[PDB]
Design a protein around this ligand. Structure first.
Ligand SMILES: [Zn+2]
Ligand SMILES: [Zn+2]
Ligand SMILES: [Zn+2]
Ligand SMILES: [Zn+2]
Ligand SMILES: [Zn+2]
Ligand SMILES: [Zn+2]
Lengths: 516, 519, 511, 48
């Protein structure tokens, strides 16, 4: 519980914003058939033109204002085009002789927008909200979206709109003002209304994960991160247990304990539990890699391009799991028991650190020869997986920023999924489709298993170049007889262009728990 | 014995050591080939060659005391097989007693005199026939010419290569692991070879013991656990021992050695074992081994590609060779000699407490040293161990160390390099290399490079600004710590680890024992 | 013969200085017993102090000048110290009121000077010569030196004093030497002058950049040398090399604008031939590395004009042998000269090439080109029916890591020949150390497709693996290989050493 | 030959062979000395 400090200026908690300005937005959903009232703030039409590439803007909705309807006639709109992400602002007087701001965002010429296309639409709409002091936004849907894509639109809007100012002191944005109202006009509105509060919950899970990831390693360390998980569990009425060093030694978690040896912060194993009232039909363990800082250890991240400055993000897996705990704890699914696990520690250089070549014993008795101290994630996960399997669950899903090779294989958009069970892999792929968090199935190639044969220990930690596959083969040795999947988010977790985390995996894991 | 510090309760507090190995349970019988070969249980292998005729036919020359086996092994039956070095074949037949017998051969090529490298290939082929076959007995028939030393090398190599180290196996022990209980040997003039049997068994264990310490990872084998293992060995052999701790090392002003260990959680431990013959002492020798339990490189971290930081548990190979030699000497009990077995044991780590590049440190002989690179730590620990050794008033000081990576580029993985200040001592090491069959090559200490160690501030620089002749410059640095004693330095950085087999060699045990014994 | 040019400004020959100012120095050797005369120029005493830190300078020799003797008194000289290479020299008037300069060079406290120590003494002497307009230098030996070390002193003095101004766009006329048992040392003088020129000649070829010194201009220079010395000569061109099936050597030169030229000079002694020798020098006029380009930091591509140092040592030896005319020996001076370049025409990594003895070679790295040219030169040398084959080459960068910049490495298939080379090293004062050919590493040269690999994958022990490759091209002759990659270039002085000339001449002469 | 379940289990030959010498060599007692570890092999020369 007490966070150790070197100096009195060292922070002792992660600052967390729970009540965000997004939570103060009053959202109203109206059916487009009753017409659009254009009364204040800014009214944006989401418009496309199927077939006609960069075709003209045509506003189909009925507008309940003679002045605004005239302004938006085809003859006036034809000078503007639908090119994906294009936007324009209009200014006019409505019937009540009041100034009104209207505009549109171009949704291109393809009838079905992908998650990537929808993100471009949201980003354009967000540029219209930034640097403009507005009390209200109204969005008119003149494009076709299913329930999942409408929810993705709102989640993405809320997430992108939100600005994280926890670490700003003298440089806070003096002109930061958030809308207080959001109006939505859509066809068959009654079917979309249930998506609003689901989107708000999904946004917060994602944003909460993002806050933990963005929090630097001096703020977010094993002690403060496990304290934050306890506070979250208390707010959601989830059962919780934090395992300290003495309990971890009794459980013989030698692989996980060796990684944390060189840290000033004691290892903290997070175990949160959600249990449905009623008959439990499915038991799930969600395991997130929780390295608060990855220096690489004695195999120091010193090579050019090793991205040591980004290593505060090495607890992204744990953050996705905690964000999922927020969503599950809030939405309260029936017939399920979910265990939210993370073997939290920090990988440092010290007289006390584990060394390359060390032989360590995992909690299942397997001896491991450490070939590289920077392949620490798989060691912490090995003991977390043994712990998860002892819970007697139906599925074990781990999520981790495990291998840099993901950037070369799938890049920054798609996470990789590996596993020992096809039905579980398919459930993750289906959750990927409904959450709109892209994942691609990658193989666990058994032919590479012989590269992990150690001359001295039972197994090698590393091979001695298909790194992400070899890491999955190593993890597979710690799951004996349970359906298991591993999601490598090393490439997708950080948004390099926006210089911020994505909170990747929260929605994917929640959809997985909810749709089961 | 000292208490090994732990970070977590799961950290090991001793090095596991196997003293009673399955090799020690093998009953060896040597028979003269003139009385004929009896072919019964187990596997009987003929070591055959064909001088001149490259890949020539197999011909069995020995009289075999079985009509059925003799018939099977006739020239007409054997001519389809050839002697190509390392080739082998298995035979199955019924003998005169209607019992199934397994026979075979290992090809020894076409060169009458086998080198140590050729003999190793023959032994490896023989070992492949022992692995994956549950045998109670092996019989070896020598139809090749081997001198006494090569015959002993054959047995040592067989024992060493056959032995499988399972100390770190838990869930992956080899379920089919079964060793022979008997070893039969047929050779011409057998009575002359008999004395080599028990000498080979001692040499095998000294080598295997060194190998066990080297293979033991740095969390198991640290300065405290390694000095504790040396105490246990000394107690078992009735050798005198003294382990110098930090307080004693500070009193002795061992600043170069102490600076290296500053960044470690393990206190420095200086090993001093002594063997003294019961009668008149005619020769006094100090054997000094480099004892770095883990070499991270320190602040000059081994971060460069190919710097092999994952292999650095082997940086105490010199200390391991010295302790393996103490086992052989303590067991064989040579007369008229006093041997000191020394190692300045420590760990080279990164910490707020570590020594830094540029630090000026004072050795026990008062020489100030400017540290140019924290990864040239071996020569610093050796400087203080050499000052200590010379104060013992010995006739020879021999050091053995995994000192310079450049050895891999100069001599490679088979031959160690020897440097020294005395030609007679170098020649004794070269002679010990020949009789132990552990190859060594004499390299020069080039005096012209000495000026590269001139420091602007300190009395001497630890390293040259480079120069690049690293192994020679390291020898010039060491030479400054021996004032008036015959001294030799064996750089084993290239030879200590068997990269292909992924295991240590235990290099230097037999070389140092032959040196002590033949003096 | 005609050197190809890209532009009309490209040079078509290597400028060579044969008549140097060193050749104009009149040398006189005197016994120290009769006292030293100080009448003109500079007089230097070579002084040591057995039992020093270094200790004070004390002059033992009697000097036949009252003014000079007063300057050289113990009280004055005690203000100076004997530290190796330390010097002081003063201008004053002698008894005849003439300007004379008198000084010393510190020789340390060790009675026996090494070749390295003597070089430091010489360098200090040369610094005084370069910054003083003198007509005469007199050296007084108050140290003990043998005949070979005395000759080394003279050669080193002449070599270091000489300044190469061929690419740029005064010297003493007399040398006096005072030494104990002066009659014993006299014959060393003209031998030193010959040894100096062979070394300096080798140095001129090495220092000559790759645009000046290319395969055509270097073979033309070898013909001119042969003509001046009355040596027999033969230059083998591409057509002849193709007929001889020299595929390993020809592959290396494929990417060059300069046709390959194989140099074959021959010295025949008067009298019955007691030994026939072939001296083979690596002759790469420029080594870019080919497709395995020298692009790595520290690969020293800018120094690669020195890659014909082996050929230069062999030609320098031909000068000494041709001048000194030893008896009962026939010598063949060989070099497979070419340039290793990047072109659409170059050989590639992976290419399989056929050597002149029919062995197929798989090229693992285009920058291990020396061994390919040497393989064909060794096959050629063995066909001559010689007693010894000695090759000299700037073969492997690993020599810098093993022996460094002072000692060359010698490898071979015959112990008697190796011992003759080490002995020649001792008498020439060009240091060499015997390194092994480890047979266990031969299996690393087993190729999946060709008869042999050019290189080992990893190598580990690169210089040894290169020697194992070369050994495959000598079937039944005593052979030695001298790797001079580390010793050829003097990095501190930014010039070649001309290493190997004196070593090879002493080898031929003492046989 | 394999041995389902029994990891690195003994070699056991099921086929009947039409040679008395070879059938004797192939008996369970002789074959159990060897194991099924993937890629492991043993072969012997004999008279049929
Ligand atoms: Zn890492
Ligand atoms: Zn990591
Ligand atoms: Zn080191
Ligand atoms: Zn070391
Ligand atoms: Zn090259
Ligand atoms: Zn070259």
């Amino acid at each position: 519980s007490e966070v150790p400090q070197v100096v009195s200026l060292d922070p002792t908690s992660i600052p967390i914003e729970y009540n965000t300005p997004i939570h103060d937005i009053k959202v109203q959903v109206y059916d487009i058939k009753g017409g659009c009232n254009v009364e204040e703030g800014l009214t944006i039409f989401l418009v496309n033109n199927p077939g006609k590439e960069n075709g003209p803007v045509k506003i189909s909705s009925k507008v309940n204002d003679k002045q605004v309807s005239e302004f938006l006639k085809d003859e006036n709109m034809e000078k503007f085009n639908v090119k994906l992400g294009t936007s324009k602002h209009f200014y006019m007087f409505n019937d009540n002789k009041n100034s009104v701001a209207v505009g549109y965002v171009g949704c291109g010429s393809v009838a079905d927008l992908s998650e990537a296309d929808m993100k471009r639409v949201v980003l354009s709409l967000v540029t219209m909200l930034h640097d403009n002091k507005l009390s209200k936004l109204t969005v008119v849907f003149e494009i076709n979206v299913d329930k999942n894509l409408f929810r993705f639109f709102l989640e993405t809007l809320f997430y992108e709109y939100m600005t994280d100012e926890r670490f700003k002191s003298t440089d806070k944005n003096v002109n930061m003002e958030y809308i207080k109202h959001l109006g939505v006009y859509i066809n068959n509105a009654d079917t979309y209304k249930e998506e609003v509060e689901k989107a708000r919950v999904y946004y917060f899970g994602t944003y909460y994960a993002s806050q933990l990831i963005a929090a630097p390693s001096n703020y977010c360390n094993p002690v403060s991160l496990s304290n934050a998980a306890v506070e979250l569990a208390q707010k959601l009425n989830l059962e919780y247990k934090i395992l300290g060093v003495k309990e971890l030694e009794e459980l013989k978690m030698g692989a996980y304990l060796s990684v944390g040896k060189g840290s000033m912060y004691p290892n903290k194993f997070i175990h949160l539990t959600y249990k449905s009232k009623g008959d439990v039909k499915k038991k799930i363990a969600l395991v997130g890699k929780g390295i608060t800082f990855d220096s690489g250890g004695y195999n120091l991240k010193a090579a050019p391009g090793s991205m040591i400055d980004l290593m505060k993000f090495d607890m992204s897996g744990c953050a996705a799991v905690l964000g999922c705990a927020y969503c599950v704890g809030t939405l309260k699914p029936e017939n399920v028991e979910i265990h939210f696990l993370s073997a939290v520690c920090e990988n440092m250089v010290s007289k006390n650190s584990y060394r390359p070549g060390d032989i360590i014993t995992a909690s299942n008795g397997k001896t491991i020869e450490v070939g590289n101290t920077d392949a620490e994630g798989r060691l912490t996960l090995a003991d977390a997986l043994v712990y998860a399997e002892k819970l007697g669950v139906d599925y074990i899903v781990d999520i981790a920023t495990l291998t840099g090779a993901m950037l070369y294989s799938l890049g920054t958009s798609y996470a990789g999924v590996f596993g020992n069970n096809e039905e579980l892999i398919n459930k993750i792929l289906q959750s990927s489709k409904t959450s709109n968090e892209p994942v691609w199935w990658l193989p666990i190639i058994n032919e590479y298993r012989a590269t992990l044969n150690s001359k001295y220990a039972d197994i090698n930690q590393i091979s001695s170049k298909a790194s992400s596959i070899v890491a999955s083969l190593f993890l597979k040795e710690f799951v004996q007889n349970t359906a298991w999947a591993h999601i490598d988010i090393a490439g997708v977790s950080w948004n390099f262009k926006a210089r911020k985390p994505k909170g990747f995996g929260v929605r994917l894991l929640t959809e997985f728990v909810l749709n089961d």
